[PDB]
A paper describes a structure:
Acetyl xylan esterases (AcXE) that target mono- or doubly acetylated Xylp are well characterized; however, the previously studied AcXE from Flavobacterium johnsoniae (FjoAcXE) was the first to remove the acetyl group from 2-O-MeGlcpA-3-O-acetyl-substituted Xylp units, yet structural characteristics of these enzymes remain unspecified. All homologs were confirmed to release acetate from 2-O-MeGlcpA-3-O-acetyl-substituted xylan, and the crystal structures point to key structural elements that might serve as defining features of this unclassified carbohydrate esterase family. Enzymes comprised two domains: N-terminal CBM domain and a C-terminal SGNH domain. In FjoAcXE and all studied homologs, the sequence motif around the catalytic serine is Gly-Asn-Ser-Ile (GNSI), which differs from other SGNH hydrolases.
Author numbering: 41 to 136, 149 to 171, 175 to 185
The structure:
Amino acid sequence: GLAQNTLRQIIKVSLGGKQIRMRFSNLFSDQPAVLKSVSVANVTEAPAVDIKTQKILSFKGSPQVTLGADEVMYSDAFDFELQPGQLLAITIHYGETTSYILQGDHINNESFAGAVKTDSIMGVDISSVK
């Protein structure tokens, strides 16, 4: 269980570009996942990020999205300073490879201090656009 919490995943991008898109797949299956808010930002150290580059994602215009079992869904296209070989952070707040869980909403939390570190949980990946 992890609903009503906030998970921040750190990934390794191998493709740079100006305009990117985010893949979302329900890895953790069974029940659906309600994504209250998603953000993408650059990584400084540890789980700490930088909001001055953070971008909040939208899904068909809506900032929230629900992902049933065996479902994949991409975010809307957003401008981002992506570089080949960079550290990327994706923070997701839910509602009823390193990864960091905090209780409650922590979309605007740089430090993520006091975070745990799990063993993934949700399939994320960068993807091209039109």
